[PDB]
Design a binder for this molecule. Structure first.
Ligand SMILES: OC[C@H]1O[C@@H](O[C@H]2[C@H](O)[C@@H](O)[C@H](O[C@H]3[C@H](O)[C@@H](O)[C@@H](O)O[C@@H]3CO)O[C@@H]2CO)[C@H](O)[C@@H](O)[C@@H]1O
Ligand code: CA
Length: 318
C-alpha cells in the first residue's frame, strides 16, 4: 500500500563491534532498536564460542554508535547464562518495558526504565511446561530461536523459529499477556534455508502487517524475505521474497564506502514514535539496523566477526 514491491537500500559501514574489554566477544548481533526523541536504544546478542548473552547501548547520531558504551545485561538480575536475540518494546497495559529473548525457552524480562541496564529482571518463560510438542516434532537438528511478540488491541502473538523451516505462532489475550500463551501453530513453513530464523512482525499505519524472515541464499549468504497480511495470523502474501526481488540482499544494497559484507542478516527496523506492543513502523522512513560480516571470513559460526550497521530504504512509496 505505502510499501513498494521492489526494495533498494543504502548501507553504512560496520559501526558496532566488540570492545577490547577482556570478555572475548566475537560478534555483536541480532539488534533490537527503538528511537525516543533523538536517542536510540539498542539491545544486542553477544556471541562467542563459549556462549551468548545480551548487551545494551545507546546513542543519538549514528556516528556516535561506534564509541557507545556497552552495558552488559549479565550485571542485571537477567544475569549470566544463555540469552540471545532480544526484542524491546513498551507494554502499555503494565507500564513496563519488556525484553523478549531466548534462553533455551522463550523468555522475557521487564524494567520500568529502559535507561537502566541493571534493572532487567531474571527471566520468566512464555512456555512454563517446556518446549511445545509441535516444535519438538518438527525441529529436526535445529534450535529454538528468535522470539518475537506483537499485539493488537485484543491479542498478543509470540513468533519463533526452529532453524528447520518452521515459523511458529502462539497467542494469548492482551489482558493475560505475558501469561497463557497457547501451544503454537505453524504459521508458515518452507525449506530450512528459505525460512530460517530472525523473524520480524510489524504493524503498518494502514492496518496491515509486515513479516520479514531471514534466509540462506544459494550463494550461502544471508538475506531477508518479506510478506504482508491483513492479520497477524495470516494468511501471508509475498511482498519481496525471492533472490531476484528480495527485501534485503547483496543485490539491492548499495554501500557508501567499502562493501564490507555480502550477508544481510538478523536485524530490526528502527521504531520511532510509539514504541509499544503494537510494533508499528513508519513505512515512509524505514531504516534497518542489521548484522554483517567480512564475506571472506569462515570458521565456527559462534566466533564469526559479526558487526552492526544500518541500511536506509532508498525507494519509499510515501
Ligand atoms: O550460515 C552459516 C551456517 O549457519 C548455520 O546456522 C547457524 C544459525 O544461524 C544459528 O542460529 C545457530 O546458532 C546456534 C549455535 O550453533 C549453537 O552452538 C547454540 O548454542 O545456539 C545457537 C542457536 O541460538 O547455529 C547454526 C549453526 O551453528 C547453519 O546451521 C549452517 O547450515 C550454515 O552454514
Ligand atoms: Ca531479532
Amino acid at each position: 500500500s505505502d510499501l513498494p514491491t521492489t526494495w533498494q537500500w543504502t548501507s553504512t559501514g560496520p559501526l558496532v563491534g566488540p570492545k577490547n574489554d577482556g570478555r572475548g566477544i566475537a560478534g555483536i548481533k541480532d539488534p533490537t532498536i527503538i528511537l525516543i526523541n533523538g536517542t536510540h536504544h539498542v539491545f544486542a546478542s553477544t556471541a562467542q564460542s563459549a556462549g551468548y548473552n545480551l548487551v545494551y547501548f545507546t546513542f543519538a547520531d549514528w556516528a556516535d554508535a561506534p564509541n557507545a558504551t556497552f552495558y552488559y545485561l549479565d550485571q542485571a538480575p537477567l544475569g549470566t547464562g544463555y540469552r540471545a536475540a532480544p526484542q524491546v518494546f513498551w507494554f502499555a497495559p503494565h507500564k513496563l518495558w519488556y525484553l523478549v529473548y531466548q534462553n533455551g525457552n522463550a523468555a522475557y524480562s521487564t524494567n520500568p526504565d529502559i535507561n537502566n541496564p541493571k534493572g532487567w529482571t531474571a527471566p520468566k518463560v512464555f512456555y512454563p511446561d517446556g518446549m511445545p510438542k509441535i516444535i519438538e516434532q518438527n525441529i529436526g537438528e535445529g534450535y529454538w530461536v528468535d522470539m518475537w511478540v506483537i499485539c493488537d488491541s485484543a491479542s498478543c502473538h509470540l513468533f519463533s523459529s526452529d532453524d528447520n523451516g518452521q515459523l511458529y505462532r502462539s497467542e494469548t489475550s492482551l489482558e493475560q499477556f505475558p501469561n497463557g500463551m497457547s501451544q503454537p501453530v505453524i504459521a508458515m513453513q518452507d525449506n530450512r534455508n528459505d525460512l530460517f530464523e530472525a523473524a520480524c512482525v510489524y504493524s503498518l499505519p494502514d492496518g496491515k502487517y509486515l513479516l520479514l524472515v531471514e534466509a540462506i541464499g544459494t550463494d550461502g549468504h544471508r538475506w531477508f524475505r518479506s510478506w504482508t497480511a491483513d492479520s497477524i495470523r495470516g494468511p501471508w502474501q509475498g511482498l519481496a521474497n525471492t533472490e531476484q526481488n528480495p527485501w534485503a540482499r547483496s543485490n539491492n544494497v548499495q554501500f557508501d564506502g567499502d562493501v564490507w559484507t555480502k550477508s544481510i542478516s538478523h536485524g530490526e527496523i528502527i521504531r520511532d514514535g510509539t514504541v509499544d506492543e503494537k510494533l508499528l513502523i513508519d513505512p515512509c522512513n524505514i531504516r534497518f539496523m542489521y548484522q554483517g560480516m567480512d564475506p571472506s571470513a569462515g570458521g565456527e559460526y559462534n566466533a564469526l566477526p559479526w558487526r552492526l550497521g544500518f541500511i536506509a530504504h532508498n525507494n519509499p512509496a510515501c
